[PDB]
Amino acid sequence: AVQQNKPTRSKRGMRRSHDALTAVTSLSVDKTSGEKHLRHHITADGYYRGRKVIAK
Amino acid sequence: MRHRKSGRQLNRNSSHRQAMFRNMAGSLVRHEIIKTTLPKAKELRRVVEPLITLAKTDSVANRRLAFARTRDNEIVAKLFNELGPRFASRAGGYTRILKCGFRAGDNAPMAYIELVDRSE
Amino acid sequence: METIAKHRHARSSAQKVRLVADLIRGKKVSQALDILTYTNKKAAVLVKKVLESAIANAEHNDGADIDDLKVTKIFVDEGPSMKRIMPRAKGRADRILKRTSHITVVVSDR
Amino acid sequence: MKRTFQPSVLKRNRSHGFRARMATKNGRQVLARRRAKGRARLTVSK
RNA sequence: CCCGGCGAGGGGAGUGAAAAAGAACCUGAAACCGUGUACGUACAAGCAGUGGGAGCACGCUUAGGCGUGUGACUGCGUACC
RNA sequence: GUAACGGGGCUAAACCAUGCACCGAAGCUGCGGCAGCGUGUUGGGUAGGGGAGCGUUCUGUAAGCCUGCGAAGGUGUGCUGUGAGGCAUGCUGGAGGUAUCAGAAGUGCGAAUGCUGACAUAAGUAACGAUAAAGCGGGUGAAAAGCCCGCUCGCCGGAAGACCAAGGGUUCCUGUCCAACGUUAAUCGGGGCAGGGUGAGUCGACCCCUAAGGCGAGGCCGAAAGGCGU
RNA sequence: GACGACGUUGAUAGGCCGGGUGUGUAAGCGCAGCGAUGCGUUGAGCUAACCGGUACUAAUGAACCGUGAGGCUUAACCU
Question: What is d(CA C40, CA C35) in angstroms, rounded to the nearest whole number?
C-alpha cells in the first residue's frame, strides 16, 4: 500500500493537534529550606519530610 | 490474561531474574542503601524481608536455609549477629522506598531504598 | 526595551523544539525556569541554556531590572543540514539527513 | 559466498606490469596512449 | 566585559562610509518552514471559482453608501496536454 | 435501498377540442465603442494560407545623453493602451545604462517515464544488524547503564584460545582534545592533534641448481606486423 | 487513554501473625546392621496469587482551573 496524492499543510498540521505537550504542574516548596521539588520526590540534595537521607 | 496474578517479569527469563534479585539482596544487606529503578525496588521488598524475619531465630537448620539462599557467607554472617537483634522488636516493614527522579541515559524512574534506621 | 539572545547551529531537529518552546511563551522568567528545569527532554536543556543566557544578557548590558522580565518572543528556525548515506538491502543506497535548528528568545519587561 | 577478486602481487605484476607492457607492440601503443592523455599512474607503482 | 563546559553559540564596547559587509563574508528572488496582527469556522457534502451580498476592523472626508482586508447566505459550475 | 413521472404531491396540478394573457436564449431591437470590404454589407472556428506588431543580447549613429543629490538588479503602490506591454514613485541596492532610426541573431517554455541543483508529503511512522545476561559501591567530570577500580553472576573452551603464509600499510605505545565518524549519550575508540617504537653468521628472503612454462644469437616459415624453435 | 476504590478522621497496596491448601517423615542427634539402608525425636520441614486481623513501611501542610445573583420582547399571577 502507498498513497495516491499529496496532503497539504492543513491536514498535516491538523493531525498534529493532540501531539503537543503538557506542563508538569507538580511542583512544591519544602517547608524548611524553601527550595523546590516535585511531589513525593526528594530534592536535589536529599530532604523529604525534613529528614536527613545521605545528602550526596 | 492477568486477573489476580502476582510478580513482575522485567523482560528477562526466570533464572536471570532469580540471579539478579539474589545479587541485589546481597548488595543491599551489605551496604544498607542502594539506588535502583522503581519497578525493581517495588518487587525487591517481596524477597529481602523474609530473609530478615528468618534471621530472628538462631537455629542451625535455619542458618543453612539462609545460606541456601543468596549463596554467600559474609552476608549471612551480617545477619544473625547485627541485623538480627536490630529488628527483634519490630513487626514487619524493614526497608523503605523514596523516589528520586529520572536518569539521563534512558529516563528510568529511580528510587532510593534503605533500611529503617541504618545506624548512620 | 527588547532583548535578544539567539543560538545558531544547535544539534536538534527543528520540529522537536516546538513541543518545548510552546510551553513557556508569555510566562514570567522564574516560573519558566521552574518548568523548564524539570522536563526530561533534550530541547529543554538547550532552551534553558538559551534563557539563562538571555536574562544575564539583559541584566548586564542593559540592566532592565531582573525580577520582572517576561519571556516575550520565542521561536525556532531551520538550519543547515548534513547529507549522509545509509546502505540497504540488494545494493540499494539511500541518503539520510541530519538536521540543525536555530533558537531565538527575546525577553522584555514591557 | 566466494567473491570474484582474491588478490595477489606476483600474478598482478606478471600480467599488468610495466615490463609485460613493453613486451608487445600493442602494449607499447597502450603506454603511448596513457602518456598522451597525461595520467599520473602509467601502468602500476609500488 | 558578561552568559556559557578555560567549549560551540551570542550580547555590549571598538575599527570602519556601511558589521541588516564578521569570515559558511557583494547583490540574496522562488519552491519550503515559523512568529504577530485583523476577519472567518465546530448541523453542514463534492475541480474550491464566478455573479450577487449583510456584518466586522483599519484610513480619508469634517458623514455622504469612499478605499483596503475578511466573506455568514445564495443562482450557476465534472482540472491541463 | 423506495427505483418504469426529476422530487414534493394532485382527483385535477391527467386527457380531448377552443379562446384570452404571460414567462422563456449569447436570436431581433434601442443605446455606446472597435475593425475588415465595396453610405450599405460583414466580423465562432481545428489542419493550413495571407497581413500587421511587442519584447531581449550585440554593432553603427556615440569622445553624444543620464548617473554617488545614486546606474543595472530585487520587492510594493498608482496611472495608460484593443493585446504582447509602457510610464512614475516609496524601500533595498553601491557603479554602470542607453533615446530615435538602421543591421545580425545561441531571441520568448508547462508537459518529451526530458538534464542538473535545491526542498516537501508519506512521518517524527518501520527500523537500531544473532534471544551468550547482567547487578551494586568508589573515583574522574558540566553531564555516567555503556570509560577506570573493586565484589558477585553468566558464555566459549577442537574455539568465540595461541601461533604462521597470502593480504592490508602505522591500525602498534604514551600524552592531549569531542565540532565531524561510532545506527543513541562518550570523559571512551581502530576518530583529530603531537611525540615515541621494529636491533640477527644460526629465523625467512638474497645466493647455487632444476620441473610444468615464457623469452630466445644463428636458422626455418611468412604480403608488412609476425609465428615456431637449437 | 477511559472506569472503580483509597490519601492519616486511614485496611488502598507490600510486610507481620493465625488459618486453609499442596508436597509427603527436613537438618542435627541416637539405635540396629561390616554396608547399601532401615527405625525414633515427628505427619516433621517448606509453602506464588487465598481468608481474616494488625498502622511496622509508603500514600506529605500544599499549588493550578472554575466567580461575584445570570441579556431583550410579550403574556399570565402576586404586590
Answer: 11
Q: Please name the amino acid found at residue C58.
A: A
Q: Which positions ≥6 away from A2 have C-beta within 8 Å?
A: none
Contact B98 A48 (CB under 8 A): yes
Q: Domains of chain D (ranges plus CATH)?
A: 1-46 (1.10.287.3980)
Structural domain that includes position C11:
1-110
Which of the 8 DSSP states describes residue C42?
Answer: H
Every domain of chain B and the residues it spans: 13-116
Q: Which of B11, B8, B26 is nearest to B83 (CA)?
A: B26
Q: Which residues of B6-20 are buried (b: 16+ CB within 10 A; e: fewer)?
A: eeeeeeeeeeebeee
| Neighbour order of strands in the sheet with C3-10 | C3-10, C101-108, C70-78
Rounded to 10 degrees, what is the CA torsion of D39, D40, D41, D42? Answer: 50
| Euclidean distance between CA atoms C58 and C106, whole angstroms | 10
Experimentally, how was this structure solved?
cryo-EM
Cβ of residue C66 closer than 8 Å to a chain A Cβ: no
Resolution in A: 4.0
Topology of the domain comprising B13-116: 50s Ribosomal Protein L17; Chain: A, (3.90.1030)
Q: Minimal Cα distance from C18: which residue of A?
A: A20
- Determine whether the interchain pair A27/C19 forms a contact, defined as Cβ–Cβ distance below 8 Å: no
Cα angle B56, B119, B29 (rounded to 5 degrees) comes to 55
Closest to B86 (Cα-Cα) out of B59, B58, B108, B116: B116
